[PDB]
Design a protein around this motif. Sequence first.
Motif, PDB file in Angstrom:
ATOM      1  N   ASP A 384       0.848  -1.195   0.000  1.00  0.00           N
ATOM      2  CA  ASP A 384       0.000   0.000   0.000  1.00  0.00           C
ATOM      3  C   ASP A 384       0.877   1.236   0.000  1.00  0.00           C
ATOM      4  O   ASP A 384       1.396   1.630   1.044  1.00  0.00           O
ATOM      5  CB  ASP A 384      -0.920   0.025   1.211  1.00  0.00           C
ATOM      6  N   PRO A 385       1.064   1.842  -1.178  1.00  0.00           N
ATOM      7  CA  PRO A 385       1.971   2.947  -1.260  1.00  0.00           C
ATOM      8  C   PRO A 385       1.250   4.258  -1.003  1.00  0.00           C
ATOM      9  O   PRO A 385       1.903   5.306  -0.990  1.00  0.00           O
ATOM     10  CB  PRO A 385       2.447   2.879  -2.707  1.00  0.00           C
ATOM     11  N   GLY A 386      -0.071   4.206  -0.797  1.00  0.00           N
ATOM     12  CA  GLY A 386      -0.852   5.384  -0.405  1.00  0.00           C
ATOM     13  C   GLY A 386      -1.723   5.970  -1.513  1.00  0.00           C
ATOM     14  O   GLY A 386      -2.059   7.148  -1.475  1.00  0.00           O
ATOM     15  N   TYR A 387      -2.058   5.136  -2.496  1.00  0.00           N
ATOM     16  CA  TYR A 387      -3.015   5.418  -3.544  1.00  0.00           C
ATOM     17  C   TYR A 387      -3.302   4.069  -4.201  1.00  0.00           C
ATOM     18  O   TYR A 387      -2.656   3.080  -3.912  1.00  0.00           O
ATOM     19  CB  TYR A 387      -2.426   6.353  -4.593  1.00  0.00           C
ATOM     20  N   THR A 388      -4.291   4.046  -5.074  1.00  0.00           N
ATOM     21  CA  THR A 388      -4.517   2.948  -5.964  1.00  0.00           C
ATOM     22  C   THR A 388      -4.152   3.449  -7.383  1.00  0.00           C
ATOM     23  O   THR A 388      -3.864   4.633  -7.580  1.00  0.00           O
ATOM     24  CB  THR A 388      -5.999   2.452  -5.899  1.00  0.00           C
ATOM     25  N   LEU A 389      -4.146   2.552  -8.362  1.00  0.00           N
ATOM     26  CA  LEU A 389      -3.850   2.941  -9.735  1.00  0.00           C
ATOM     27  C   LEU A 389      -4.976   3.808 -10.318  1.00  0.00           C
ATOM     28  O   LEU A 389      -4.710   4.709 -11.131  1.00  0.00           O
ATOM     29  CB  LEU A 389      -3.589   1.711 -10.579  1.00  0.00           C
ATOM     30  N   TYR A 390      -6.211   3.558  -9.861  1.00  0.00           N
ATOM     31  CA  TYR A 390      -7.346   4.447 -10.144  1.00  0.00           C
ATOM     32  C   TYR A 390      -7.060   5.919  -9.757  1.00  0.00           C
ATOM     33  O   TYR A 390      -7.255   6.839 -10.563  1.00  0.00           O
ATOM     34  CB  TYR A 390      -8.583   3.982  -9.416  1.00  0.00           C
ATOM     35  N   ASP A 391      -6.573   6.127  -8.543  1.00  0.00           N
ATOM     36  CA  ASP A 391      -6.250   7.473  -8.067  1.00  0.00           C
ATOM     37  C   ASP A 391      -5.156   8.115  -8.898  1.00  0.00           C
ATOM     38  O   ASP A 391      -5.185   9.314  -9.129  1.00  0.00           O
ATOM     39  CB  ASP A 391      -5.783   7.437  -6.598  1.00  0.00           C
ATOM     40  N   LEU A 392      -4.166   7.310  -9.287  1.00  0.00           N
ATOM     41  CA  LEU A 392      -3.028   7.786 -10.053  1.00  0.00           C
ATOM     42  C   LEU A 392      -3.464   8.155 -11.472  1.00  0.00           C
ATOM     43  O   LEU A 392      -3.040   9.164 -12.011  1.00  0.00           O
ATOM     44  CB  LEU A 392      -1.951   6.722 -10.093  1.00  0.00           C
ATOM     45  N   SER A 393      -4.326   7.337 -12.057  1.00  0.00           N
ATOM     46  CA  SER A 393      -4.924   7.614 -13.354  1.00  0.00           C
ATOM     47  C   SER A 393      -5.626   8.975 -13.332  1.00  0.00           C
ATOM     48  O   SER A 393      -5.425   9.797 -14.237  1.00  0.00           O
ATOM     49  CB  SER A 393      -5.907   6.493 -13.695  1.00  0.00           C
ATOM     50  N   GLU A 394      -6.424   9.225 -12.286  1.00  0.00           N
ATOM     51  CA  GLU A 394      -7.086  10.500 -12.168  1.00  0.00           C
ATOM     52  C   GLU A 394      -6.084  11.659 -12.094  1.00  0.00           C
ATOM     53  O   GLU A 394      -6.274  12.725 -12.720  1.00  0.00           O
ATOM     54  CB  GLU A 394      -8.065  10.561 -10.985  1.00  0.00           C
ATOM     55  N   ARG A 395      -5.037  11.480 -11.308  1.00  0.00           N
ATOM     56  CA  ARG A 395      -4.053  12.511 -11.197  1.00  0.00           C
ATOM     57  C   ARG A 395      -3.456  12.787 -12.590  1.00  0.00           C
ATOM     58  O   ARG A 395      -3.279  13.930 -12.989  1.00  0.00           O
ATOM     59  CB  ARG A 395      -3.001  12.087 -10.225  1.00  0.00           C
ATOM     60  N   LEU A 396      -3.224  11.735 -13.356  1.00  0.00           N
ATOM     61  CA  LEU A 396      -2.642  11.880 -14.667  1.00  0.00           C
ATOM     62  C   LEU A 396      -3.566  12.572 -15.669  1.00  0.00           C
ATOM     63  O   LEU A 396      -3.093  13.278 -16.561  1.00  0.00           O
ATOM     64  CB  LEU A 396      -2.148  10.517 -15.157  1.00  0.00           C
ATOM     65  N   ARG A 397      -4.880  12.393 -15.504  1.00  0.00           N
ATOM     66  CA  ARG A 397      -5.878  13.075 -16.325  1.00  0.00           C
ATOM     67  C   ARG A 397      -5.853  14.588 -16.146  1.00  0.00           C
ATOM     68  O   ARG A 397      -6.128  15.315 -17.104  1.00  0.00           O
ATOM     69  CB  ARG A 397      -7.294  12.531 -16.111  1.00  0.00           C
ATOM     70  N   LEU A 398      -5.496  15.072 -14.948  1.00  0.00           N
ATOM     71  CA  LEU A 398      -5.484  16.523 -14.727  1.00  0.00           C
ATOM     72  C   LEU A 398      -4.259  17.144 -15.339  1.00  0.00           C
ATOM     73  O   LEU A 398      -4.176  18.363 -15.459  1.00  0.00           O
ATOM     74  CB  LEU A 398      -5.607  16.921 -13.242  1.00  0.00           C
TER      75      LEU A 398
END
Lengths: 463, 455, 454, 455
Positions: A384-398
Amino acid sequence: KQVTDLRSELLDSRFGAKSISTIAESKRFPLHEMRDDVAFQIINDELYLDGNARQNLATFCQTWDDENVHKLMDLSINKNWIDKEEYPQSAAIDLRCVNMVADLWHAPAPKNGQAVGTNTIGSSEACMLGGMAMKWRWRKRMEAAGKPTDKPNLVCGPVQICWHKFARYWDVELREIPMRPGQLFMDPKRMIEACDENTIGVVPTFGVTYTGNYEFPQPLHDALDKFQADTGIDIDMHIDAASGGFLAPFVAPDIVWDFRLPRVKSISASGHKFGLAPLGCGWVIWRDEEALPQELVFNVDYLGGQIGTFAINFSRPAGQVIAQYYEFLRLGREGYTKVQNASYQVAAYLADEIAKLGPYEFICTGRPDEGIPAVCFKLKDGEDPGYTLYDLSERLRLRGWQVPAFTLGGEATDIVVMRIMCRRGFEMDFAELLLEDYKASLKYLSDHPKLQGIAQQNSFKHT
Amino acid sequence: ELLDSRFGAKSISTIAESKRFPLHEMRDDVAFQIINDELYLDGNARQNLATFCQTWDDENVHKLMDLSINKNWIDKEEYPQSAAIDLRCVNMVADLWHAPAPKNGQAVGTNTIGSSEACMLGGMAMKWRWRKRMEAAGKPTDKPNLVCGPVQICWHKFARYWDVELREIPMRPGQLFMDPKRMIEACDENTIGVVPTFGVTYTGNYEFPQPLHDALDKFQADTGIDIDMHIDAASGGFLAPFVAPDIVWDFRLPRVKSISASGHKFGLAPLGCGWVIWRDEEALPQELVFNVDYLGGQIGTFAINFSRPAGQVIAQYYEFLRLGREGYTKVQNASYQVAAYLADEIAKLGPYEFICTGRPDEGIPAVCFKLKDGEDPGYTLYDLSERLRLRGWQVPAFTLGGEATDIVVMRIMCRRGFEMDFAELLLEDYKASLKYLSDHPKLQGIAQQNSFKHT
Amino acid sequence: LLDSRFGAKSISTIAESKRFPLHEMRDDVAFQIINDELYLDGNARQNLATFCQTWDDENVHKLMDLSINKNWIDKEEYPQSAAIDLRCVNMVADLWHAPAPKNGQAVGTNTIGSSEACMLGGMAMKWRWRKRMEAAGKPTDKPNLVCGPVQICWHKFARYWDVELREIPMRPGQLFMDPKRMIEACDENTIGVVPTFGVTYTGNYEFPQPLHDALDKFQADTGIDIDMHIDAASGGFLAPFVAPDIVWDFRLPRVKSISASGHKFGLAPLGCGWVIWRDEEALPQELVFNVDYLGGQIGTFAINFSRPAGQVIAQYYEFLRLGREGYTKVQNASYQVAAYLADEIAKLGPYEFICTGRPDEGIPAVCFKLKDGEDPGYTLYDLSERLRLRGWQVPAFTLGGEATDIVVMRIMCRRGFEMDFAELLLEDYKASLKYLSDHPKLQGIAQQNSFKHT
Amino acid sequence: ELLDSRFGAKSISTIAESKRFPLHEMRDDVAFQIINDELYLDGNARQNLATFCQTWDDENVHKLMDLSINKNWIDKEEYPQSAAIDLRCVNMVADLWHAPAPKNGQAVGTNTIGSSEACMLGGMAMKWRWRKRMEAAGKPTDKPNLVCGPVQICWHKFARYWDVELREIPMRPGQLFMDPKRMIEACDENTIGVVPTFGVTYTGNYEFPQPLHDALDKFQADTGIDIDMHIDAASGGFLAPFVAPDIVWDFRLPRVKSISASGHKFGLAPLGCGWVIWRDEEALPQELVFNVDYLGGQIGTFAINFSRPAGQVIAQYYEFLRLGREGYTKVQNASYQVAAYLADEIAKLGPYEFICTGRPDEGIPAVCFKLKDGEDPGYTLYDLSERLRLRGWQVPAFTLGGEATDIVVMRIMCRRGFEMDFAELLLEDYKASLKYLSDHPKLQGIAQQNSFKHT
């Protein structure tokens, strides 16, 4: 007390005129004429709301722009693919492409000088045609042997949606070997387990949509040989080479996946993926005349004789064939090799750099010998690095990027993967930008821990 | 040692290799000029009076298509506006065809690459409604049939690909279409649907759905068998609603469960555009719709194809917006004026029996005719068709199917672009061709190849 | 090592990006390399933060393209460009009701934007004030400039020209320069007052007339005679058309100069501004530079020098094709979009409006905050983030001064942002709200101010 | 009523109500053609040999300019790639000029609209550095001066607009430039800086910063007054580093704290491009930089302008990329070869004394000459400049300043596009001009208007 000078109707600031809305009354057929250049500007302006896909790394489809491709498409807007009489040169160009693709995949030399094959709109049509022909060969074989033909099945791995439609639309039972931890793909053993005398064929996916990895047909081919020695049951293959069919022959010729394998009776691939053609181009090749039941072929009369087609579609523009041919002509083996290598270089670099950043386990790392220029990874189990890949995908969309997170299938229904596709145009410099955007996204997630676990919609995974 | 006079350089031949994948790169601009130069061997179609497909050119349509080269029709997520525009088109075609008002505000139906795919979808939907209906009644579902007239090749393909017995009512002299009596003679419990052709390819005449509809009502009253229709409106679906709105042929007829039409025929779209609309949700069995995941939720598609460019949709939109009912009405009537004028003029030039004369209450803007039986003017219509080719026209001559197998027709399609002045020019070449055959009697009976008739 | 576009050895822009390149590369590769990276820019079509023109007109692209090489400063080689530019100055002067020039030509100039126009206006102010103090025997070493929530160009002016900026702070319940606080900051050292006729941060007009009244009374009470430069960056191409009865321009005797951006609501493409002076007396000649050419000499007041004439030429194109009649319709359409948005948005959350896109109050902008003590379960920062995910840039940021705790969202309605696009924004706004409500853990996370400056 | 022959319609004059904002709309396309037609009256500048600014045409540049009409240079947030390109140009220009390597990776500098803005920024920074130190010493700071030679008009504007006293060393016979001796005479504790002109506008000659630099060192040695330099390299800045790398004029000199140059002169960018580079963070007072919030953080700008298009920067980058030092060296050598050739041929035609002859070690690609003192060949250079205008050439004649108010010079500028063949045509026309002046002596002495000398 008034100070204004207003008008009592809705205006448009582009046209300095009464407003025309595409949105009001968009549910009836328009009643009146409007000025042509106005309708054009209205539509042209709404089309700015589409993406351009340059930062979309989920798609396999071509999104780079070559001027010569633009001009060829534009000359061809009225060139009807199906109409050999009026467009004999488009017809001729189309026939060259079929030979060329046939040759690339090691199709046995024709008796008559023309390969058995056809252009299609995409892999989807190409698959139906392959599927149908499978079904028909199998029906004839069982009928010859006085057996019922009402329970056909088809054995495959984590196929693309086109096989789910084929199976459904053509009343064939789909025996899809499920993904499971440790083997996401159709292995020889589970394949044989699913096979019987009702199996119309097996479809290995040569470049699996979800992950990027090749299913290798050679070891499957061996099992089908051993299967025939053991049971008398003689099963063939159709290769779904949507992506890999314009990759391996150039960067990994030693992979034996194609008509080099006797059981391989037909192959499909997507021209508008790694074939480099613009949207609307697919290919299917059959090994020879025997592989393609003449019952499926329709003969139409035209002035120079009569031509045989096996197509779901009929009338359509010939420009994508024409551009495909352009790509073949300008590149050759030599240029395709260079162009696909570049994309692999990109994928491999991304894999080695992303590995440094997170607790990741890799399914695909853009190696020519294992699959397509794709990077596929999940979080290491129990990390658990403190996000999921879903969260990271969202960050990348912005930051403008579309890098899909989604769940695997079958027994891997709770593994979330990130998949990055590297197509033409997404060069090294664009991958460095991605990398910088990825690191900035991690920092952000690290600094904003409340963001964890919030996002959970799968991105579009299919093409 | 071979040189090319264009490039002032060693020759590159598209015919050398042409059967092996090329080995070497070549310069992009050379490959481009090579291919461009060979494309001059295709026709322009302006003079090809066989086809139904759009062959005119409008700069705006060229512009929109070119903008759209990379717009993926399936990829709703990346190209949401292309998606929104498609959806407007589905609603406008539904409304054109008097579909019932939808509860959720979106009509049921889809864009396709052509009539062919739209026919496959309509076909499958027929087959599934009948199958489900029969299964729910505990009955065998392995012998489905389809009743139709002189149908377009897509129905033959549908039948073969989907294992449906095609019960085609043959053409016969006097009666070159599906009449109610022969329709009913072919119908039964295994009949998945009747398919009237609202614009028969070979003749240009409309099969009228209404009398056929009445015959199906009586058939239900008499036997309990309840048979639905899918109208193949490849051509008539963008004609009658503007120039003959009182012909009741569409979703005004309860049994009409779906309709299809080609946007790239009289819908005025470029090649690669067809449409299919269903009456409502019930007319479309959900089993056939595939729901994919994307970020705004999920969208259901009913398609044989998958990725393909969105430009034809966007162009079809442009046509809908720029013209509307009023514009379509003027555009289609102008083609009818061309066809009616040619019928009249050709009639004066030899001993002809007309099958179709461009009347809007009867069919599409086509002229279809044969030589009067017996009367021998000194050529066949094949001969006349060959003469016309020497002057650049393609005016096809071919035989009818079925029991009309002796009949040789000529068919002229009047499409956008082929105006009154061009019709006059054809007439002049027609006369000059007749003059030549009179002056060269030996020519009679020589030509015997049917020209392409299907689209 | 390889590039997929060129099927050749890779050339990276990012590698040696820090040194001057050593070797030649083929022009068409260098073009395609740059053209491909330019796709990473936005198109701004969904950017609602900027005032600048982002719509496309084929005729404007042609006029700019013809003009790439036309030197705005070289009247001799480009006399026609010069003529067109002089008509523009006259027409803008006429729009703002400048006194008819004695010679035939208004006192004014084209600029690159409002920034330069402002510096020019501020310099003239400073000189006029200086001359008036000298003739009275007084010191000139502590000039100040009285203003409200001005655009950054005035902080730049104040700093670069050593003027004390007495900016009246934005406060809750009083966001703008009002007469009383204006007068409290005035003195014999005040070089002038700058009302902002379209406040950058909110969209509202600061009305010069009431401020003008106070400056009359101030001269009556103290003898101190203070002038105005109006910063009409945005309002200067709005009010004369849709609110001609607002008395803000040269009709007021104290307004000695006015500036506006042609590239905002002037409709010109990027790189066009205007400043006009009441008359010759309002422009100290010592600031004007005479260059010699074959036809005689002209005077310019400019911070820049050589630069292209296409923007001026395109500006003239808009003046000619639209006139008063055309502009009135074009700006009206923007206001209708803004007012609609304001009304619709007001139904969707507990919001307090500062600007609602009404032409008597301001520019085609919507500006709002959450109501005091009201918590819908998201901040405007949060909403702005969800909005970016559907493609829009709808900036949220803080107001300054004593209103520094105050977070607003500001929506700018510019040409091209038509009613249909606004409906889609509204669908996207609803969808964002819904998502925020389903995901309450999102509240409060985003906290970066969006770019607010133009 | 009045008609227009273009439109076959009532006339619309641009001249009639040209003093009033127009009342009414007119058709867009008519407004365009009206404007387009007027613009034909502009020169194209190809035969204009007075200007330094780019006048050649490159399709690729036009394409990048047109793509960028809406890209806002200031808006780093919406156009983050234009920003990135801009920053690359800043580092590249810094490197070209031997700026010390940045402690952080980014050079201190900015694009500007032109040299003009760049000089103000440089001028302001000198002002503030000087001010800080004099304020430390509690000294009066209300009388700053700036010491220079025959500067471009931007220094006169800077002086006036920022209340700095301009100590311009006058031109005088045999010494047309700022020399060390006279420079030093003009320096004192109020001198904010010295501005050598590395490519004098009026003549083309370089003012060499190295001997000036030595003198300033000696000055600090002798008086404790430490004076820095700003190099106005408007033209020299993109010439010397490629064709005369050995001239030490840039950041290799410790006192050089900033440099400015025009991209749209010999940098080869289209109009609307300048650069100013500072040595390091210390050479640029922080109080002058404005920090502006946005999504990804905040950036500082030192600019006089604000919103404006990014296209010229983009085009600049294009030239840096396609050329490199290798390509630039060739381009500029080409212009020098042409200048040198014209100097050589022109000396054969009359009694001339050259100030500049297109030597790359002396100045820019320019030829500058006057009539030998007390020599009368039967025309003045004004007369010659008139004959050459009748052949389409603008070859400016003007008087020098200061103590050489007496000298009339002819100056020819050789920029990209003015190739050897056009130089040959000018010479042909030059000789045709001398012949005519000879055949008509009464022409002598008639013309007396200075041509525009400034850019």
